[PDB]
UniProtKB/Swiss-Prot annotation:
Function: Poly-ADP-ribosyltransferase involved in various processes such as Wnt signaling pathway, telomere length and vesicle trafficking. Acts as an activator of the Wnt signaling pathway by mediating poly-ADP-ribosylation of AXIN1 and AXIN2, 2 key components of the beta-catenin destruction complex: poly-ADP-ribosylated target proteins are recognized by RNF146, which mediates their ubiquitination and subsequent degradation. Also mediates poly-ADP-ribosylation of BLZF1 and CASC3, followed by recruitment of RNF146 and subsequent ubiquitination.
Listed result of changing M103V: Loss of activity
Subunit structure, interactors included: Oligomerizes and associates with TNKS. Interacts with the cytoplasmic domain of LNPEP/Otase in SLC2A4/GLUT4-vesicles. Binds to the N-terminus of Grb14 and TRF1 with its ankyrin repeat region. Interacts with HIF1AN. Interacts with RNF146; this interaction leads to ubiquitination and proteasomal degradation. Interacts with NUMA1.
Taxonomic source organism: Homo sapiens (Human)
Post-translational modification, as annotated: Ubiquitinated at 'Lys-48' and 'Lys-63' by RNF146 when auto-poly-ADP-ribosylated; this leads to degradation. Deubiquitinated by USP25; leading to stabilization.
Tissue and organ distribution: Highly expressed in placenta, skeletal muscle, liver, brain, kidney, heart, thymus, spinal cord, lung, peripheral blood leukocytes, pancreas, lymph nodes, spleen, prostate, testis, ovary, small intestine, colon, mammary gland, breast and breast carcinoma, and in common-type meningioma. Highly expressed in fetal liver, heart and brain.
Protein name: Poly [ADP-ribose] polymerase tankyrase-2
Binding site for Zn(2+): C130, H133, C138, C141
Length: 209
């Protein structure tokens, strides 16, 4: 059911999605251990993900969440990196994409910083890096991230010093780093249907000059 439409680098849509990738790269406390050392990406391809059944499943949950939240879906566009990207675009988010040992509980994690999502592309902690070179910092192998449509509803705000249930009366968690002033937020949902993987982004990290 999924088809992938290539966006043209000349399309303004390509350009804004790229802009969202590039502008939300930050430094990481791990010095680049998990995701590699870089300031920017070489974007190789951006594809629109089209699945009518996954879309309808998303919008159905959105309306529900909306209605429970004073007509406010609190829909964001957020990054998600994961070794399961190929499975997610075809069958959608589920409990097997949940982070059991996450700071904010057992659910699916999403990030405002593209470089936060890039840390998970090879697994928790960057796993053992790219399959070809075992390099968490590989500048050669093609990586992929999702830029997703996420329904937050009433988000429970959790400060951090940086599948479960949502907190009673809440539809998601906002994990908001309180120490690193430059680290953007992360969000957790507990239902696969609250996220839609709209864009599939293919890229390399770029070695700094
Ligand atoms: C925090 C986070 C951001 C993100 O873009 N992707 C993640 C994936 C996971 C994850 C969960 C289960 C299996 C593999 C993963 F990479 C955990 C946390 C994140
Ligand atoms: Zn590699």
């Amino acid at each position: 059911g999924t088809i992938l439409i290539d966006l043209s680098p000349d399309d303004k849509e390509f350009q804004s999605v790229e802009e969202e990738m590039q502008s939300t790269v930050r430094e990481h406390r791990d010095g680049g251990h998990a995701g590699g050392i870089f300031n920017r990406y070489n974007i190789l391809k951006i594809q629109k993900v089209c699945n009518k059944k996954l879309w309808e499943r998303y919008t159905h949950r959105r309306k529900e969440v909306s209605e429970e939240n004073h007509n406010h879906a609190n829909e964001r566009m957020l990054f998600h990196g994961s070794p399961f990207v190929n499975a997610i675009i075809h069958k959608g988010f589920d409990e097997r994409h949940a982070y059991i040992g996450g700071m904010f509980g057992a659910g699916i994690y999403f990030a405002e910083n593209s470089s936060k999502s890039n840390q998970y592309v090879y697994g928790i902690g960057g796993g053992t890096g790219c399959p070809v070179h075992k390099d968490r910092s590989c500048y050669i192998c093609h990586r992929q991230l999702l830029f997703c449509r996420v329904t937050l509803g009433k988000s429970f705000l959790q400060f951090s010093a940086m599948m479960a249930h949502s907190p009673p009366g809440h539809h998601s968690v906002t994990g908001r780093p309180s120490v690193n002033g430059l680290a953007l937020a992360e969000y957790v949902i507990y239902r696969g249907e609250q996220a839609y993987p709209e864009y599939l982004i293919t890229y390399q990290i770029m070695r700094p000059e």
